[PDB]
Design a protein around this ligand. Structure first.
Ligand SMILES: Nc1ncnc2c1ncn2[C@@H]1O[C@H](COP(=O)(O)CP(=O)(O)OP(=O)(O)O)[C@@H](O)[C@H]1O
Ligand SMILES: Nc1nc(Cl)cc(N(Cc2cccs2)C2CC2)n1
Ligand SMILES: [Ca+2]
Ligand SMILES: [Cl-]
Length: 460
């Protein structure tokens, strides 16, 4: 009696799970919103520098109308290797944003020291990989208490990690010069100092890792194996050949119903083999509306959660009306940011610019009265941006990369408390000139040639 091979592996639920971390896939939590949970772990924020420039070049005529296809190929060639390293070291990729990704090793408080060692080794191996396009990799690490927030409505869900360690990992990474790994202060405080050769960062309690220098008896693989005891989802045994346990998920309509809420409809359409895979990789004219919600420095996560929930409910209704989408949500330095996009798969209109501006003002007016939100700032920029699925086969997300994305994000930070827009949006809108005010030109870090910027004043 024959015993033929292959556990079938490519169910819709498995494909959906590629778009989510284990934190969500295996989360089994309440469907109330907001939902908050608390844990400890180590974070790694890996930020590639140089794909936004590569993006601009790939629109040129030399790429012969295949710039999006070539961009996404070369990006994924590099990012998929990084993702594999993270997964093999036992980490959970939480979210992608353009050419960056945030990863988490959730562990019990007693294991933080040991896990920091595993994550530093992983970081050094990620720097390893890149002795090969013009691109640097900056890595920040942090460790400590982390809170998870899940917010949404009955058909959509969104998550974030929050707290000092999240702020710290971002601050750490941002200090790295090309190809450095930086530890947060608390990470350096908790780590195994005998193993880890560091140096001062000027005007900073963070430190740069110079070397991993283990003792005589230390064998990394035996050490790593012991650390796997504390990793709940590390593929093992008959599944040690897999990069994720999520590859073994079996059909379960209730779990699927829950996971699909995190993923865009156009992505679900591709997952369901109702649209061609290549259709979502594009260099497409869009309008980016980047909305920043600032909370007071005193604010704790249990106050932040209901306020993001409230803002979200309004953002989503306004976007539905004006034909916009939330591409990604971020939070650090007391600012929760919604990266919103007008134009992309299906939603292409003619009055898109007018609509992005009115939508932005509606969001600004509503969110300004949400209890606990100190300041709303919204940057609006229009241009050619790369849209597509970034990452590895087993762990990837839809995202956007482009100069106008970065510009919108810089506007919102440099021109706080107002709605700002770029020249393309200004000249291209229906609207008369006195709806606007021309702004003083600020020198913006990582932005040159930016052109005239405007405040969207409104009808009044
Ligand atoms: N998705 C993201 N989430 C959080 N912070 C980000 C981010 N992208 C960039 N940043 C932060 O802002 C800092 C400056 O980023 P920038 O210099 O403006 C673009 P980059 O990340 O260097 O290269 P790039 O745009 O080719 O990819 C970063 O070092 C990082 O701390
Ligand atoms: N707060 C938060 N949560 C998640 Cl899950 C991701 C995220 N971001 C922004 C941050 C990067 C570094 C610390 S927070 C990642 C996807 C870019 N921010
Ligand atoms: Ca980047
Ligand atoms: Cl891949």
């Amino acid at each position: 009696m024959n015993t033929p091979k292959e556990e079938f592996q490519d169910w819709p639920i498995v494909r959906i799970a590629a778009h989510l971390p284990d934190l969500i896939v295996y989360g089994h939590f309440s469907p109330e919103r907001p939902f908050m949970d608390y844990f400890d772990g180590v974070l790694m924020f890996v930020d590639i520098s140089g794909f936004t420039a590569m993006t601009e070049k790939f629109s040129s005529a030399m790429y012969m109308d295949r710039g999006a296809e070539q961009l996404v190929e070369i990006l994924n060639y590099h990012i998929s290797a990084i993702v594999e390293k993270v997964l093999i070291f036992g980490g959970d990729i939480l979210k992608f944003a353009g050419d960056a990704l945030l990863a988490l090793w959730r562990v019990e408080r007693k294991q933080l020291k040991n896990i920091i060692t595993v994550v530093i080794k992983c970081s050094l191996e990620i720097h390893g990989l890149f002795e090969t396009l013009d691109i640097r990799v900056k890595i920040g690490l942090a460790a400590g208490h982390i809170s998870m927030l899940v917010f949404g409505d009955e058909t959509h869900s969104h998550f974030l990690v929050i707290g000092q360690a999240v702020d710290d990992v971002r601050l750490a990474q941002n200090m790295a010069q090309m190809n450095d790994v930086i530890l947060s202060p608390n990470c350096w405080q908790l780590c195994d100092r005998s193993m880890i050769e560091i140096e001062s960062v000027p005007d900073q309690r963070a430190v740069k890792v110079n070397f991993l220098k283990p003792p005589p008896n230390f064998n990394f693989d035996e050490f790593f194996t012991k650390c796997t005891t504390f990793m709940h989802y590390y593929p093992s045994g008959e599944h040690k050949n897999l990069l994720r346990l999520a590859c073994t998920l079996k059909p379960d309509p209730e779990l699927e119903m829950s996971l699909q809420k995190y993923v865009m409809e156009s992505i679900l359409k591709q997952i369901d083999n109702k649209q061609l895979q290549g259709y979502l990789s594009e260099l497409r004219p869009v309008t980016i509306v980047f909305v920043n919600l600032m909370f007071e420095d005193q604010d704790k996560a249990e106050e932040i959660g209901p306020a993001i929930q409230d803002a979200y409910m309004h953002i989503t209704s306004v976007l539905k009306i004006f034909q916009g989408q939330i591409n990604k949500v971020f939070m650090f330095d007391k600012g929760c940011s919604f990266l919103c996009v007008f134009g992309f798969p299906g939603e292409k209109v003619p009055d898109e610019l007018t609509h992005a501006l009115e939508c932005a003002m509606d969001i600004f007016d509503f969110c300004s009265q949400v209890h606990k939100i100190q300041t709303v700032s919204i940057g609006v920029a229009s241009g050619i941006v790369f849209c597509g699925i970034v990452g590895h086969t087993v762990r990837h997300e839809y995202t956007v990369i482009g100069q106008k994305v970065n510009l919108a994000a810089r506007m919102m930070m440099y021109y706080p408390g107002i709605v700002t827009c770029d020249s393309v949006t200004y000249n291209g809108s229906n609207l008369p000139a006195y709806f606007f005010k021309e702004l003083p030109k600020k020198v913006m870090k990582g932005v040159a040639d930016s052109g005239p910027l405007y405040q969207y004043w409104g009808r009044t």
